[PDB]
Amino acid sequence: HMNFQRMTDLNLAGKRVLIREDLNVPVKNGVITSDARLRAALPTIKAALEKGAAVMVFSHLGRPVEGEPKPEQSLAPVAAYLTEALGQEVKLFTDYLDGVEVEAGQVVLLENVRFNPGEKKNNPELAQKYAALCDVFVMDAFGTAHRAEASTEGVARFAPVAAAGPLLAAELDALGRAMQTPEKPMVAIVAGSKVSTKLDVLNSLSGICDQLIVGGGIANTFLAAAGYNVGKSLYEADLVETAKQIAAKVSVPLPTDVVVADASQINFEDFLGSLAAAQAVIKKVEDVTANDMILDVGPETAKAFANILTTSKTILWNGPVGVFEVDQFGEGTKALSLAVAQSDAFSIAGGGDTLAAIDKYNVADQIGYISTGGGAFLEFVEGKTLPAVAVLLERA
Numbered sequence: 001h002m003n004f005q006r007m008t009d010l011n012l013a014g015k016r017v018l019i020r021e022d023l024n025v026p027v028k029n030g031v032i033t034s035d036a037r038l039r040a041a042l043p044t045i046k047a048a049l050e051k052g053a054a055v056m057v058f059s060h061l062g063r064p065v066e067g068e069p070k071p072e073q074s075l076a077p078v079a080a081y082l083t084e085a086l087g088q089e090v091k092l093f094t095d096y097l098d099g100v101e102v103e104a105g106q107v108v109l110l111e112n113v114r115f116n117p118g119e120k121k122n123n124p125e126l127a128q129k130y131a132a133l134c135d136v137f138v139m140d141a142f143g144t145a146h147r148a149e150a151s152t153e154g155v156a157r158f159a160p161v162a163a164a165g166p167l168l169a170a171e172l173d174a175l176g177r178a179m180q181t182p183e184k185p186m187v188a189i190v191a192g193s194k195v196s197t198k199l200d201v202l203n204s205l206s207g208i209c210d211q212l213i214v215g216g217g218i219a220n221t222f223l224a225a226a227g228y229n230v231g232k233s234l235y236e237a238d239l240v241e242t243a244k245q246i247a248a249k250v251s252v253p254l255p256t257d258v259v260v261a262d263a264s265q266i267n268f269e270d271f272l273g274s275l276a277a278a279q280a281v282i283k284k285v286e287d288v289t290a291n292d293m294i295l296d297v298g299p300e301t302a303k304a305f306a307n308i309l310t311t312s313k314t315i316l317w318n319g320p321v322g323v324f325e326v327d328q329f330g331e332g333t334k335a336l337s338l339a340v341a342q343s344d345a346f347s348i349a350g351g352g353d354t355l356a357a358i359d360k361y362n363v364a365d366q367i368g369y370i371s372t373g374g375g376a377f378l379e380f381v382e383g384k385t386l387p388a389v390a391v392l393l394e395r396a
Contacts, residue, residue: 001173001176002172002173002176002180002393003393003396004163004164004169004172004389004392004393004395004396005161005162005163005164005392005395005396006163006164006165006166006169007044007047007048007136007138007140007163007164007165007166007169008047008166008169009163010051010136010161010163011051012048012051012052012053012136013051013052013053013104014052014053014054014104015053015054015135015136016053016054016056016102016133016134016135016136017048017053017054017055017056017134017135017136017138018056018058018130018131018133018134018136018137018138018155018159019044019045019048019055019056019057019058019138019140019165020058020059020137020138020139020140020141020144020151020152020155020165021041021044021045021057021058021059021140021141021165022037022040022041022059022060022140022141022142022143022144023037023038023041023057023059023061023075023078024037024059024060024061024062025037025038025061025078027061027062027072027077030071030072030076030077031077032077032078032081035081038078038081038082038085040167040372041057041140041167042085042086043166044138044140044165044166044167045057045082045086045107046086047166048138049086049105049107052104052105053104053136054102054103054104054105054106055102055106055107055108056100056102056107056108056110056133056134057082057107057108057109057110058109058110058111058113058151059075059078059112059113059141060112060113060114060144060151061073061074061075061078061112061114062112062114063114064112064114064115066114066115066116066117066118066119066120067115067116067117068115069094069111069112069115073112073114073115074092074111074112075092075109075110075111075112076092078109079091079092079109082107082109086107088106088107089106090107090108090109091108091109092108092109092110092111093108093109093110093111094111096110096111096133097116097126097129098129099133100133113149113150113151116150118150119149119150119151120149121149121150122148122149122150122153122154123150123154124154126150126154127150127151127153127154127155127157127158128154128158130150130151130154130155130158130159131154131155131157131158131159131160132158134159134160135159135160135161136159136160136161136162136163137155137156137159137161137162137163138163138164138165139152139156139162139163139164139165139168139388139392140164140165140166140167140168141165141167141168142167142168142171142172142371142373142376142377143372143373143374143375143376143377144376144388145168145373145376145386145387145388145389146375146376146379146380146384146386146387146388147387147388148387148388152387152388153387153388153391156388156391156392156395157391157394157395159395161395162391162392162395162396163392163396164392170369171369171371171373172389174348174368174369174371175348175371175377175380175381177314177346177348178314178315178316178346178348179208179380179381179383182208182313182314182346183313183314183346184210184313184314185210185211185308185311185312185313185314186208186209186210186211186312186313186314186316187209187210187211187212187213187308187309187312187314187315187316187345188205188208188209188212188213188315188316188317188318189213189214189215189315189316189317189318189319189321189336189340190202190205190212190213190214190215190218190318190319191214191215191216191218191219191318191319191320191321191353192215192216192217192218192319192353193216193217193218193234194217194218194236194239195217195218195221195222195236195239195242195243196236196238196239198218198318198378199239199242200382200383200384201318201378201381201382202218202246203246204381204382204383205250205316205381206246206249206250207250209250209251209316210251210312211250211251211252211253211308211312212246212250212251212252212253213252213253213305213308213321214252215297215319215320215321215322216234216319216320216321216322216323217234217235217236218243218319219255219294219297219321220233220234220235220294221235221236221239221240221243222243222246222247222252222254223235223254223255223285223294224237224240224243225240225241225243225244225247226247226254228285228286228288229288229289229290230288230292230294231260231263231288231289231290231291231292231293231294232263232290232291232292232293233260233288233292233293233294234293234294253304253305253308254285255285255297255298255301256284256285256298256300256301256304257282257283257284257285257297257298257299257300257301258282258283258285258288258294258296258297258298258301259280259281259282259283259294259295259296259297259298259322259328259329259331259332260280260281260283260288260292260293260294260295261275261278261279261280261281261292261293261295261329262278262279262281262291262292262293263291263292263293264291265277265278265279266278266293272323272325272326275295275323275326275329276326276327276328280295280296280328280329282298282299283298285298295322295323295329296321296322296323296324296329296330296331296332296333297321297322297332298332299331301332302321302331302332302335302336303335305321305335305336305339306335306336306338306339309336309339309340309343309345310339310342310343312343312345313344313345313346314345314346314347315340315343315345315346315347315348315368316347316348316349316350316381317340317347317348317349317350317354317367318349318350318351318354318378318381319351319353319354320332320333320336320353320354320357321333321336324357324360325356330360333357333361334361337357337358337361337363338361338363340363340367341363341366341367342366346368347366347367347368347369348367348368348369348370348371349367349369349370349371350370350371350372350373350374350377350378350381351374351377351378352374355370355372358370
């Protein structure tokens with residue numbers, strides 16, 4: 001367990017509580033198109049209210065230019081959402097840097113922090129103005145924890161008390177359970193188009209994992225590292241030697257069979273289209289020709305991965321093992337998703353492709369923790385020091 005203060009453990013009676021949330025919702029013509037991020041932050045706001053706190057919520061929205069506010073990036077529709085959802089008037093304040101009025105039991109929404117000069121640069125003066133508004137700072141937005149900014153890092157530095165919200169706390173706990181002395185055997189699944197893009201991820205997990213399952217373009221590069229022909233498969237020739245060294249440092253299981261398509265049927269002007277129309281072929285891993293494209297793992301490999309995942313007691317899931325968007329190259333990922341879900345191992349998943357796989361094969365219930373951290377999620381797995389988490393450690 002890691003040592004930082006948590007909002008839920010604090011008495012907030014009569015205290016001014018400033019909560020950093022991720023309310024960056026998609027907006028079209030002043031209407032919120034998806035409220036998933038809102039429904040996620042709501043229990044935190046309600047918990048603060050049930051504790052007799054005076055709640056201030058602020059957030060970033062879109063990519064506006066600091067000092068040039070535009071209506072299209074205003075949190076106004078979010079304030080209206082919070083009003084209907086909480087049953088009280090949630091006012092939006094546009095000029096709050098020199099003080100904002102809030103009483104016990106009510107909620108105020110401060111305007112987009114991206115409107116404020118010095119925000120991106122973690123300006124000390126701006127951070128102090130933030131901190132002066134509260135008795136307790138609560139960081140509840142993990143997806144932004146990997147950047148050092150005025151509303152995510154600096155405010156925690158100058159606030160009287162700095163703590164982690166329930167969302168952040170749940171994320172760090174789940175990540176710690178997998179990254180800090182996990183129960184062995186520890187297996188991670190790492191997939192993507194390029195080894196280079198997830199190189200730090202691979203090297204980091206190489207030290208933590210007992211076995212390292214790879215998928216997609218990454219898997220093809222490791223496959224080439226084992227001396228096999230990959231034909232016209234997607235892989236990185238310049239990182240074959242690096243993958244080779246990794247496979248020597250940690251156990252990287254290699255497919256015994258694969259699903260390929262012939263490149264004469266692939267038009268990259270419309271890749272997904274020509275992939276669905278193409279003829280899928282199951283072949284032995286050594287029977288791959290010069291014009292072949294590996295697009296999924298075969299039936300035998302899928303069982304082999306499953307046994308590994310059934311035996312492990314800790315799973316980190318970051319990617320599919322084939323182009324599952326098209327069904328004929330999706331059996332590998334379907335089998336993998338079922339293997340992770342039914343393993344008594346504690347399983348943690350992260351990354352867009354992973355979540356898409358979880359949604360498609362309906363195994364969300366059976367995943368230990370599903371992270372929405374994105375880039376922040378990967379940087380933690382990389383072993384890097386997320387600025388927003390580190391300051392919370394210093395203030396706790």
